[PDB]
Every structure is written in C-alpha cells, then in structure tokens.
Design an enzyme around this catalytic site. Structure first.
Site, PDB file in Angstrom:
ATOM      1  N   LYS A  60       0.814  -1.217   0.000  1.00  0.00           N
ATOM      2  CA  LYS A  60       0.000   0.000   0.000  1.00  0.00           C
ATOM      3  C   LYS A  60       0.849   1.270   0.000  1.00  0.00           C
ATOM      4  O   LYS A  60       0.419   2.312  -0.490  1.00  0.00           O
ATOM      5  CB  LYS A  60      -0.933   0.023   1.210  1.00  0.00           C
ATOM      6  CG  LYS A  60      -0.190  -0.103   2.528  1.00  0.00           C
ATOM      7  CD  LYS A  60      -1.006   0.364   3.717  1.00  0.00           C
ATOM      8  CE  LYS A  60      -0.179   0.213   4.980  1.00  0.00           C
ATOM      9  NZ  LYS A  60      -0.758   0.895   6.176  1.00  0.00           N
ATOM     10  N   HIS A  80       0.965  -3.011  15.322  1.00  0.00           N
ATOM     11  CA  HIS A  80       1.460  -1.966  14.437  1.00  0.00           C
ATOM     12  C   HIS A  80       1.564  -0.637  15.170  1.00  0.00           C
ATOM     13  O   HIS A  80       0.564   0.054  15.369  1.00  0.00           O
ATOM     14  CB  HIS A  80       0.555  -1.822  13.213  1.00  0.00           C
ATOM     15  CG  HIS A  80       1.050  -0.823  12.214  1.00  0.00           C
ATOM     16  ND1 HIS A  80       2.301  -0.902  11.641  1.00  0.00           N
ATOM     17  CD2 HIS A  80       0.464   0.279  11.689  1.00  0.00           C
ATOM     18  CE1 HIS A  80       2.464   0.109  10.807  1.00  0.00           C
ATOM     19  NE2 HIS A  80       1.364   0.840  10.817  1.00  0.00           N
ATOM     20  N   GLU A  83       6.172  -5.711   8.868  1.00  0.00           N
ATOM     21  CA  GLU A  83       5.468  -5.152   7.722  1.00  0.00           C
ATOM     22  C   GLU A  83       5.942  -3.741   7.374  1.00  0.00           C
ATOM     23  O   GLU A  83       5.144  -2.807   7.366  1.00  0.00           O
ATOM     24  CB  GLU A  83       3.968  -5.133   8.000  1.00  0.00           C
ATOM     25  CG  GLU A  83       3.372  -6.489   8.325  1.00  0.00           C
ATOM     26  CD  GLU A  83       2.001  -6.368   8.963  1.00  0.00           C
ATOM     27  OE1 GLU A  83       1.764  -5.370   9.676  1.00  0.00           O
ATOM     28  OE2 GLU A  83       1.161  -7.266   8.752  1.00  0.00           O
ATOM     29  N   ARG A 119       7.261   2.512   4.497  1.00  0.00           N
ATOM     30  CA  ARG A 119       8.047   3.693   4.154  1.00  0.00           C
ATOM     31  C   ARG A 119       9.558   3.462   4.234  1.00  0.00           C
ATOM     32  O   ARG A 119      10.325   4.079   3.493  1.00  0.00           O
ATOM     33  CB  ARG A 119       7.630   4.895   5.012  1.00  0.00           C
ATOM     34  CG  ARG A 119       7.865   4.731   6.491  1.00  0.00           C
ATOM     35  CD  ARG A 119       7.240   5.866   7.288  1.00  0.00           C
ATOM     36  NE  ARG A 119       5.792   5.717   7.419  1.00  0.00           N
ATOM     37  CZ  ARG A 119       4.901   6.599   6.977  1.00  0.00           C
ATOM     38  NH1 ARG A 119       5.304   7.706   6.368  1.00  0.00           N
ATOM     39  NH2 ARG A 119       3.606   6.373   7.145  1.00  0.00           N
ATOM     40  N   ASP A 140      -7.599  25.046  -3.673  1.00  0.00           N
ATOM     41  CA  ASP A 140      -8.361  24.743  -2.471  1.00  0.00           C
ATOM     42  C   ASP A 140      -7.614  25.336  -1.284  1.00  0.00           C
ATOM     43  O   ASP A 140      -6.385  25.406  -1.295  1.00  0.00           O
ATOM     44  CB  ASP A 140      -8.505  23.227  -2.315  1.00  0.00           C
ATOM     45  CG  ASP A 140      -9.202  22.834  -1.028  1.00  0.00           C
ATOM     46  OD1 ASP A 140     -10.449  22.766  -1.023  1.00  0.00           O
ATOM     47  OD2 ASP A 140      -8.502  22.586  -0.025  1.00  0.00           O
TER      48      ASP A 140
END
Ligand SMILES: *Cc1c(COP(=O)(O)O)cnc(C)c1O
Ligand SMILES: [Mg+2]
Lengths: 383, 125
Positions: A45, A170, A247, A250, A325
């Site tokens: 991801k 995590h 896991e 980054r 924005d």
C-alpha cells in the site's frame, strides 16, 4: 546517479519522479544487518509500483497486501502465497473470499466481526491476532485488540475451530519512543501464552511497520532496532522456534524517490502598513496535497523544496498546489530566489504514500527508475 | 419512518426524501449502540461523521456499516463526509486512510459542492 537523470529529463510539463532502486537494495541489506531474525513483508500500500515489488520479490521479501488488487499484483509476479499476508484492518467477505480462493493463508483480525467473516468465507485460514499498542500521530479510533478482548477472541476462535497461529501489532510512523515496541512485544508474549492455554500452538510474531524511511527523522531506524532486538531475545528467544516477521512500508521506499514539479503560476504579494512593507512570492505547481502530498493533510508534514537551478536575493515564499483549495498548501513559508513559470522544483524523500489517483482521475505520474552498474550486479545476485 | 434492514448487528430505518436517507444503528455485542446518519445517492452511500470524538466501537460499527453497504445496498462507493474546520481533521483522515479510504479531490463529480467539508472515499472490488 542522483540528479543526472533528473537534469537529462529537465532538458528534454507534467510532474515526474526519479527513483533509485539501488537505494532500495541498500535499505534491504540494512534491514538484514539490523534485524537478522526478522523477515520483512513489504507493505505494498505504501508504493505499489510494479518495479518496486519486482525488485523486493527478487531480493526475497514477503508481502503485506491489503486488497484483492495488491494480492493479484504480487501473485502476478510469481510470488508464492507463503510470502503473502492479508493484513487489512477492515476486510469484507468478498475480499477474504478472494484470499481463500487464491491460496493466501496468513490473515489478520482484531475483532469478532472479522473473525466470524473469516469463519464464514475462509476456514482453515491461519489467523494472526492483531493487538493494540499504546497511543502515547494519534488516531480517532482504536485499532487492534486489548488483552481482555484478545483472550475472548482466542476462546471464540477455538470455539469456531479456526486456527490462530500468531500475533501482530502496528506501532505506526508517529512513534517517538522505541519503548512502545518493547511493551507491544511484551504484550504479544502475554497473548502467545494465552493461546497456549486455549490449546493453540502459535509461532508467528509480526511486529508490523512504522520504521522511518529517511535519516531526516528524530528516531532513527537503527536506534529503534537496537531496542527491538534485545526485547525479542527476552520475550521470543530463537530456541522457541518463533517465526518473526515485520510489515515495513516507508522504510524501503521513502528516500529512494525524488519528485520534480513545475511552477504553473506565480503571484507577488506586497504587505503594506504605516506606523512592515514586505514583498513575498507565492508559486503554484502542478502537484499538491490531493496528489503526491497527502502527507501534508495526514501528518502535517513539513516538506522542503530544493532548487534544481542552484544560484541572487532571497524572498519569503510559499508553494501551493494546482487546485486552489484552501488546504492545498505545500510549503507555508520558505526562502527562495525569484522563480518563474516553467521552472522546476525538487522534493526528496517522496517514495512513501505519494505515488497513487484512479478515483480522482489523476493519472499516475511518470517514474524513471535508475540502477547503477554495481547495484544491478547486486540485483543479479538475488535473482 | 420505514424499517429498511435488520441483521444481528444492525438496524436501519429510512427517512422520507428524494434520495433515500438511512439511519443506521450498529448494535455490537457488549458494545454501545451507534447511530450513523447516511444518505444513498447515485449508488453511493455518504456517511455523516458527527462533531466531536467517535464513540466506542466505531471501528466494528464501521465494519458492519461497510459490509451493509456492499451486501445489501450493493454500493459502488462509500463516502466519509465531515466538517473541514475541525481540530482533529488530520486524525480522521489518517484513521479512514487506514480503513482504506482515500482523500477525494475537491470538485469531484461524486461529491457535493461544499468547500467547508472534507470527503474520503472507499471503493469495493
Ligand atoms: C499502514 C500499515 C503499515 C505501514 O507501514 P509503514 O512502514 O509505516 O509504511 C504496515 N502494516 C500495516 C498492517 C499497516 O496497516
Ligand atoms: Mg516503515
């Protein structure tokens, strides 16, 4: 090997990436030296680029997938199911069904709903119970089971004849205290033991991710692992036969990517008041917080712009995305020379949670991968 | 009011409108009941995140809510809609990000024109 390909692509519009695979190989070697007992399962991801996943596949990492798409991608690269864990905090019946149909065994859960869904669609799955960690960066909702909940879920699992083979947790990237790992590990042991009392033979420990991807952080990676390793030796000695995985996301990809954006608009702002008289600049670039810079909205990240054209008087300056924005501000204040529409700006450490969306219609920016000779030889070693 | 759906973990009741308004109550075992105001429009569900902290069991509540959106509603997308000017905006964004939501570009066709609001989206596979 650094800004050469960058400059080459500048010489001869759309914002693009330059990524160094050698840096990734360096990260992997570094992981091997820092955590020799722990098998890395790359969190796809973070960056689901085919080249990244292929490189890490060749090097022999596992893969933490969170969807049918990531599973399909990883499998389509020849990766056996044994190197895949389905670790999505919230899974649907169809997702779990796809995992069951495609050979994926290892799967996480932290709740009775996820458990009943697993019993529903994927019996004979190897469940890994996710436990909560101390929230000192914080989240609006509790993730992972408490110890009490963990016991109840173990009993419920044996009750449903589902096999629980381990524990995961995590900490997250917002960690500022490596102690958080120790505690978690301690807790994991306390859950492992609980399993032993229920009649489970657990062997899998998953310490999740959150490990930093660059040295531009407070808590360095080696500083974390230096605390992790003794904690592991105490609560999970090698002799026990425990299998330890992680896991990381980054950590593998963050510093390998450099983003080049182009100034598409420019405004001059003069503040006048009698009694400051200050002339500042603001630049609009072709990427923003709804593109590659989600971290601005997520973590209130402070990105630093780099001149591709190093020189000139410096002016107070701000950098904005193309959406106009109120939240699309990339850099609130920084000292820059006067630049122009068409000039380029570089942002380093842009490999994690940047690339990839399809929903917004925003086509993925082009990525140029670069590998030095020796790095490609080292690449040829693993394969 | 009209009784929409009843499961072992949910109870939904419809309020009269052009696009169907769904009051979705999660009833997790040994957990406080949680009411979400949602709207079903264009095959998508839009969930209003209320001001202040999220209740206990919001995770499981959202799990069953999502499962309800895919199974019963057959939705293509589920949207998180909340007031942009919150002190915990980033925390929410991170949270639903973990849950699998992604930030919606302001001006997207599937999101109503409200610059005072943030939207995240979840797409089933
Ligand atoms: C989000 C997530 C990660 C992220 O890891 P990073 O190193 O912080 O990128 C890892 N594992 C799981 C299960 C996650 O949900
Ligand atoms: Mg990491």
């Amino acid at each position: 090997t650094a800004k050469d390909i960058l400059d080459q692509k500048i010489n001869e519009k759309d914002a693009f990436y330059v990524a160094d695979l050698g840096d990734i190989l360096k990260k992997h070697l570094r992981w091997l030296k820092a955590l020799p007992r722990v098998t890395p399962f790359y969190a796809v991801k973070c960056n689901d680029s085919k080249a990244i996943v292929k490189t890490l596949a060749a090097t022999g990492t596992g893969f933490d997938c969170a969807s049918k798409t990531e599973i399909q991608l990883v499998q389509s690269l020849g990766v056996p199911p044994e190197r895949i864990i389905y670790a999505n905090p919230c899974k649907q019946v169809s997702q779990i069904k796809y995992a069951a149909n495609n050979g994926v065994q290892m799967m996480t859960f932290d709740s009775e709903v996820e458990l009943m869904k697993v019993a529903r669609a994927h019996p004979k799955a190897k469940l890994v119970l996710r436990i909560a960690t101390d929230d000192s960066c914080r989240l609006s909702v509790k993730f992972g089971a408490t110890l009490r909940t963990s016991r109840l879920l173990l009993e419920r699992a044996k009750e449903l004849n589902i096999d629980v083979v381990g524990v995961s947790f995590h900490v997250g990237s917002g960690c500022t205290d490596p102690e958080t790992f120790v505690q978690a590990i301690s807790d994991a042991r306390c859950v492992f033991d609980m399993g032993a009392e229920v009649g489970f033979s657990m062997y899998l420990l998953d310490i999740g991710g959150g490990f930093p991807g660059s040295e531009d952080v407070k808590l360095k990676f080696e500083e974390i692992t230096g605390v992790i390793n003794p904690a592991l030796d105490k609560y999970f000695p090698s002799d026990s036969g425990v299998r330890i995985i992680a896991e990381p996301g980054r950590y593998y990809v963050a510093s390998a990517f450099t983003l080049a954006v182009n100034i598409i608009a420019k405004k001059i702002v003069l503040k006048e008041q009698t009694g400051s008289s200050e002339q500042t600049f603001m630049y609009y670039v072709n990427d923003g917080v709804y593109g590659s810079f989600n971290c601005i909205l997520y973590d209130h990240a402070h990105v630093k712009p780099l001149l591709q054209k190093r020189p000139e008087k410096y002016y107070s300056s701000s950098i904005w995305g193309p959406t106009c924005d109120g939240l699309d501000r990339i850099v609130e204040r920084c000292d820059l020379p006067e630049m122009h529409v068409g000039d380029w700006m570089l942002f380093e450490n842009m490999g994690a949670y940047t690339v990839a969306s399809t929903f917004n219609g925003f086509q993925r920016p082009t990525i140029y991968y670069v590998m030095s000779g020796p790095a490609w030889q080292l690449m040829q070693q693993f394969q | 009011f009209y009784s929409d759906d009843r499961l072992n973990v949910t109870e939904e009741l419809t309020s009269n409108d052009k696009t169907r308004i769904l009051n979705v109550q999660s009833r997790l075992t040994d957990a406080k009941r949680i009411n979400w105001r949602t709207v079903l429009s264009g095959g998508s569900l839009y969930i209003e995140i209320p001001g202040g902290a999220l209740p206990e069991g919001s995770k499981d509540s959202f799990a069953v809510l999502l499962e309800f959106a895919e199974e019963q509603l057959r939705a293509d997308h589920v949207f998180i809609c909340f007031h942009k000017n919150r002190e915990d905006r980033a925390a929410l964004l991170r949270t639903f990000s973990f849950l699998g939501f992604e930030i919606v570009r302001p001006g997207h066709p599937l999101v109503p024109k409200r610059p005072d609001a943030c939207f995240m989206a979840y797409t089933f596979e």
